[PDB]
């Protein structure tokens, strides 16, 4: 869809999950948006 | 295919299908579709 669905410096609406605690099951879906356990345990909605 | 209401792979869209014809010679094979493939069995076999 790049021919019709792209912007010069846009297309921020296209999102994908970059990190997760564990892999999803076959044909499984996850819509949660909790902070990833980046090295440390997942922080509860804060920086750290 | 044409709904395009899945702009983000995160929170992807799902559908269930039953009670129809499934003529794959047209589906996934018209000009708009750039790529198409089947795993484990050829489309020619799936056609029937």
């Amino acid at each position: 869809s790049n021919k019709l669905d792209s912007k010069v410096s846009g297309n921020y609406n296209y999102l994908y999950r970059l990190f997760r605690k564990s892999n999803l099951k076959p044909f499984e879906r996850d819509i949660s948006t909790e902070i990833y356990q980046a090295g440390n345990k997942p922080c509860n909605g804060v920086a750290g | 295919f044409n709904a395009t209401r899945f702009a983000s792979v995160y929170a992807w869209n799902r559908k269930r299908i039953s009670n129809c014809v499934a003529d794959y010679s047209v589906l996934y094979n018209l000009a708009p579709f750039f790529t198409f493939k089947c795993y484990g069995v050829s489309p020619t076999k799936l056609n029937d």
Partner: antibody
Amino acid sequence: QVQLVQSGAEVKKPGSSVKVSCKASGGTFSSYAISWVRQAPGQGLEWMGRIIPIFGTANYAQKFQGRVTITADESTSTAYMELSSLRSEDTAVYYCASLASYSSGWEDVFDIWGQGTMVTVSS
Amino acid sequence: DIQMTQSPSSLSASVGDRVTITCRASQGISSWLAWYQQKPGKAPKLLIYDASNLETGVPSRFSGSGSGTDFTFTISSLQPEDIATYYCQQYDNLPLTFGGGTKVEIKR
């Protein structure tokens, strides 16, 4: 339920800088997003910026880039906007909005506002 | 940047009459265009976000369609409580552009 609470009336001299707030409540704060909008007495709408407090990413309109900044903190459960170079034309009703449209197939449109803060710039 | 217009700028009809409006944009698209119902100084209510699509909670009283640079928006019926201004919005690209407005009111 999800709700937004805004501050009271605020006024400042031209050319100054002002701080405004939008208190979010209900459900889980980390799952919400906040946006800011301005509404005059009949002029068209203006959109200032957008933030995702859980992740801290923000973006802006070209008209307000540089002169305006947004910060939001979960611990205080409110979102903040920073304004500078205020002028008389800013006299309007200032609204904060929640963009829940990012995780269920609903995309990039608000469905919840606060009470709205009227603002005025005059000598 | 993306610019759009609405025509006609005002509608007047009696209670229970059919209403329709159209919105034009600068670039031809087939999705990512929204519609709003707005009143002076009051919050807009979302009815359409993408071409001919709506959420849960949107009443069946509103509808829209179109292709290319012109999309239509239709209202099944009108009542006095509906005195407001319909608006079209577009978000194919980040510089969101908002419509010129169409007033709707009651004939008498």
